[PDB]
Design an enzyme around this catalytic site. Structure first.
Site, short mmCIF file in Angstrom:
data_model
loop_
_atom_site.label_atom_id
_atom_site.label_comp_id
_atom_site.label_asym_id
_atom_site.label_seq_id
_atom_site.Cartn_x
_atom_site.Cartn_y
_atom_site.Cartn_z
N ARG A 1 0.88 -1.14 0.00
CA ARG A 1 0.00 0.00 0.00
C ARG A 1 0.92 1.19 0.00
NH1 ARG A 1 -2.55 2.36 4.88
NH2 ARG A 1 -4.48 3.43 4.18
N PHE B 1 1.91 10.63 1.94
CA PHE B 1 1.54 10.07 3.23
C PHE B 1 2.56 9.02 3.66
CE2 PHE B 1 -1.77 7.17 5.49
CZ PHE B 1 -1.33 7.57 6.73
N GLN C 1 3.55 1.41 3.08
CA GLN C 1 3.35 0.38 4.08
C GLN C 1 3.86 -0.96 3.56
OE1 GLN C 1 -0.78 0.15 5.38
NE2 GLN C 1 -0.50 -1.74 6.53
N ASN D 1 -0.66 -1.43 12.75
CA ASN D 1 -1.21 -2.34 13.75
C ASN D 1 -2.70 -2.51 13.48
OD1 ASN D 1 -2.72 -0.12 15.25
ND2 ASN D 1 -0.80 0.49 16.16
N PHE E 1 5.50 1.26 8.29
CA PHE E 1 5.32 2.25 7.26
C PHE E 1 6.44 3.27 7.36
CE2 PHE E 1 3.30 5.79 9.80
CZ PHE E 1 2.59 5.16 10.81
N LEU F 1 -1.30 10.55 13.83
CA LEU F 1 -1.03 9.19 14.23
C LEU F 1 -0.30 9.08 15.56
CD1 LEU F 1 0.05 7.63 10.87
CD2 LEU F 1 -2.18 7.54 11.97
N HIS G 1 0.59 4.67 17.08
CA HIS G 1 1.51 3.82 16.34
C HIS G 1 2.89 4.05 16.94
CE1 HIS G 1 -1.27 2.53 13.33
NE2 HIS G 1 -1.84 3.67 13.64
#
Lengths: 11, 165, 165, 165, 11, 165, 165, 11, 11, 165, 11, 11, 11, 165, 165, 165, 11, 11, 165, 11
Positions: free
Chosen positions: O55, O60, O63, O102, O113, O122, O126
């Site tokens: 992904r 951004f 991942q 997660n 990521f 975030l 994370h």
């Protein structure tokens, strides 16, 4: 009072 | 990612008033910013074009976003009937702040308000997600059509809206 | 919006002692300021005019606001029986701080006190909402009618009250 | 209000040692300073005059205030058998700090201790309410009569006590 | 240890 | 109060390595520092003399204090089986820091570790109570006998220990 | 495991009064029962033999177990200066109940009380761990030497004690 | 009152 | 003590 | 111990109305029950004799116990200004229940109420400690001098009071 | 991992 | 006492 | 309402 | 599913003693039952065959499962290092209950214990997952090699193990 | 202590793109850093070599780490199915931050990521554990194969990986 | 005292439909039942006479009591804007239950609903305070003017209302 | 929205 | 859904 | 209202296996029952017709409802991307229970599972909303195509579905 | 183990 709600607006 | 800018063309009873552009703080509240951006472009089949500002209290804020019932009892997000309060990083620091209206914790839909003053008593209860970029004078003009209890004297409408960047 | 200024014309039984004006922090605690303001103009049908400061302890505070029972067991707000503790953003920083008296958490009505000293032991338990703008010397005069138990020596009264600005 | 000063005249087996004066921080902890003041004036019919320092541990603290059992298991406040911890604003910052001894939270009565060292492991558990103003050398002298287990070698008594200002 | 209680004094 | 200094004379397989002295932060953690001091002198009848460092992970820490099972499952305090975590004022700021090993919250007994690096992930979970004063070079010599799993190649023993200050 | 039975041979001033046997509920509270059992045998070097009941209040309870200060301020467990409240499964159901005295949560040492009445106000705060098996008449005899303030009028002692079962 | 404590006994 | 209550005033 | 019985001889202005006796549940709430007993005998030098019922609401309850201000703002316990809520074992199960009045949690002093109905909405907020033993008809006689707001028409006084059993 | 326990040492 | 743990067994 | 307080009696 | 049955073939020092079979409650605790089941079959490449019971205390329980360190400081689950406490539905109701040993909350690995008596003090802290189906008398025989400190007299071993239904 | 550096040699559709190296903050999160380092060396018999970034959203993050299912639903840690969130000391402070993906609190496994932007929404959910040391230009190159929804345009693969220091 | 009974005369548009009488459980929720009873007599100057049932969903409930905005956004109690959720003793047990509508916890005003079915999913979120004494047939008749979204086909009005007992 | 989960990815 | 609120009525 | 019944016509690969009808507990969980009902008719423009059961584990349950990703990572509700757990009144009492799959608290979408066994370990974590009314034998027939890992052996599909009552 | 989740299915 001075609030911003959606539906029951109070003072 | 770069933060988006959306615009609203405001019309008082039909007559154009002017354009307000807003910067959406997608770098702090991405899900809340995206909801507003998408309802502005109207890309999901509904959004703000044609909705009116149902409650304006001078020296406090202009509240709008209810495109379903037009009176404060409706509106919906692109995520569903409601979404979570993403975070409370941004505060209600001054005029021009764009923040979510709600019916208590985690009931965010489409209604929002543009602060015409610093509204710090609202901090931590309403998610701040944007600021007026250009057109504060149009918001200032909008104020003048409201009253102490919020009823507007003229129909303040978002004639058009969409994204600029 | 802009912060209201209200006034009290204090009378010690007969002769007018003088006027105390107050700035009410509506930029911090709007619901608690509007309550004092409305009760000072008397616009909602009842208010402060004619009431007494029923407990004054020199070097601590002057307490008044009980317009229904006059002794400390009454008062009521424009919102009803009682109302919530709005926030505790402001602290009891010094003389001429205006704060809500209460009977424990979320029992605000109309009773308030004018501090004649920095009462920081009360921070977090009492909502601060205003400050003496002009007229501290009239409060210092009122002081000398109290006692360590709060008993006033002479009938202190709010002869007139209303909103300036 | 104004912060009171109380004095204790200390005696070692009847022979006078000297006077210690204490500023009580009634601007921070009024209910706790008042309890100590009234017990030093004895105005409520009971108080510190004639009691002893039952536990002195050199380089830590001197403890006293048990005027009912003289051994650490008694004492009473002017408010009743025990009263709440007022707040923990002040810290055990150094020698001459006056703090309340207790049997766990909200069990303050009349016992206190005078620190002869900074005791910061005690912060948050014991209410600090005053400081030695004059007479630190007399507190130091008292230390010479204690031991690591608290035993005093001579009877260290509060020969007289009262309020100075 | 080094504590100031009223009654059960612990180490 | 004055902070005690204890010492440990270390031996590898019998052959003497040298002395490490540690200052114990009694001004911060007196019950935790008294337990280490008294187990170093042996005054309560049991202590560290003759016990070994059972787990040394190079670049991390040397763990010891198990004088009863000698392998990480024993040890005991002078207060009993286990005692409370006193407080977490101090942090694991660098090499030479001395801190309590444990088996979860409030299980302090006698096992401890000397850090050979800064271990801030352990902050808030292990009570820090001392630091190496002289002899760091002996701790670094000890590292050389451990491995990633903690196993030592030789027998690292505390030949003697006692108090200096 | 099987629930042990212990006995105390009570003596008034010098005169033997009788034997009280106790069943200890090791099927419910094993750590607490084991502490009382080991203190009744004396197998760890210290214990109950020779200690007295320092506080007997008729129609409530007899309290003993302070073998170090003999006045209610000492006692210790075989696990150290204090130990945890094991659980609160058993209730103060009637005369003959044996329960631990404490100085608030998790401070069990060696002091205990024998109920001569149902004391259900103490449920949830004191760990019940035994029951008088035989000799209730002797506890009732001990009652007769107490007073509303606990003060006994005779040295009520444990002349011998040990385990039977 | 009727309490069983170790050190500070209250009413 | 020095408190500001409405009804049961304590010391 | 055996639960105490206390009586109140009630007078309406001057005329003897009758005696009400109460069983106090010292087996459930001994500190609350002792306070009421001692104030009924007046043994600590203050108590109920001569005081009045300041608030009677027919079909709900009779409130008394304010011997210091006689209007609901006072009274005090034998333990101090106020004392904690002991426990909420008992419930307001029907007429004749005697329970404590308070000004929120842990503010018990001397005021109490005798209910003339089942008042379960008060369970968990007020401590129940007694019941009318004999004299319920005298309480029903007192009822008739109340009104919905609670103001009486005649001075309902505790002419005498004391312990019977 | 890098922990300091007494009895069950984890990674 | 009578407990079943893995590593620091207590009384 | 029907409450039993000491000082601020509400409805 | 249907509840699995596993068997252990126990040998004392060298010789076969017998087979104990266990019903595992996968209808209540499926993840804990499958962990034990798979360690009995050895299907993941490691498990119980060959490991010894390392702590047997008569009238209490037999503890085994440390197939790595064989002393109580090891074991690994099929899910990893440790796993969560699944639930506390089941209670330590009587002899033959199988339950997880742990080093506090959520530290389940592979060590377990077979109760030889009802151990209700352990309820809520150890997950119950099985019961002896056949062979209680073989567990009773195992008991006899233990001691009050857990020491075995002979090496009690799981010689073979696996699933039945 | 020394912080480990691991490298990834990226390939796009088989064609080698370039090397990215990472500093892992073992000084703050040693268990989370160790998991990554070991999955990069492949020393436990499973790891990252050959897997792909499933992904990628431009502006951004990218991942990766799902070596079992390759689509976001798998991967595992070197400690088992999942492991605890170690701590949240570090923040998502900018491009190059390496953080754990997660499925809610305490479900870390192998997926991670690489941030191409500051992602502060975030923070606190994370665990940050590393940062790009060399090769940010290769990560920026990888970005160009993403899309708004995360679909890749080419198969972005970790051709080789291992530890540098 | 006794439980009051109120009546509502229902009129569809203007035609008299019939009377519904209700018992209000003043013995479980006295404050909620006095609010409704007073708004039904209009004794405090305002109330239900003339208002409409604005939302009727067949097989669920009939909602009304908004005498200020007549659409669901208004109403007020006799105690103020809103008041507290008194307690949740009673449950939504079947047809005829009268319960409070609200806008989350502690926002009770004047809006209510009469259940035409058992609605136990609402238990614990809405305060039950009465039940239909007579006229359940009239409530079933009203249902027929509703729809799945709650909008009616005729204006259902409370033509009259008042107390009976 | 912009999240990084493992399994049920949301907006 | 089937709820009874005052203002924002949800499904 | 009355509880709805919906049906599913199952097909193994392509051939028509049979119909399973379900009762939805709208009297307990109305929002969750409505979600499933509306997704069975497909009235909001998406739904279960044509989706497959993607995970079937014999003796535990059949999972399906992901019409988006068809593998367990998708699906959505008629209320938006997810909705809250409505309540947990009902329990997984045995075969034929219909319950919501989720990815943690309040992440309900469209995936569900039909239990073929009693699964009480899932109580309080998954909302139960219905039960197989007819066709349990067809669910039994579906079980056969599953595995311990959940992978199906034939493509089990909801060929048609809708409401009956 | 035996769970019913949406996305990261564990043992």
């Amino acid at each position: 009072x001075l609030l911003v709600x959606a539906g029951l607006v109070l003072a | 990612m770069v933060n988006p800018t959306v615009f609203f063309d405001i019309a008082v009873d039909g007559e154009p008033l002017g354009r307000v552009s807003f910067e959406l703080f997608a770098d702090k509240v991405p899900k809340t910013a995206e909801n507003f951006r998408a309802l502005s472009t109207g890309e999901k089949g509904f959004g703000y074009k044609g909705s009116c500002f149902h409650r304006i209290i001078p020296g406090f804020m202009c509240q709008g976003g209810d495109f379903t019932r037009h009176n404060g009892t409706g509106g919906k997000s692109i995520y569903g009937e409601k979404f979570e309060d993403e975070n409370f990083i941004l505060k209600h620091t001054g005029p021009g702040i764009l923040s979510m209206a709600n019916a208590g914790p985690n009931t965010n839909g489409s209604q929002f308000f543009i602060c015409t003053a610093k509204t710090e008593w609202l901090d931590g209860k309403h998610v701040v997600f944007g600021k007026v970029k250009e057109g504060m004078n149009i918001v200032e003009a909008m104020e003048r059509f409201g009253s102490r209890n919020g009823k507007t004297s003229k129909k303040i409408t978002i004639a058009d809206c969409g994204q600029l960047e």
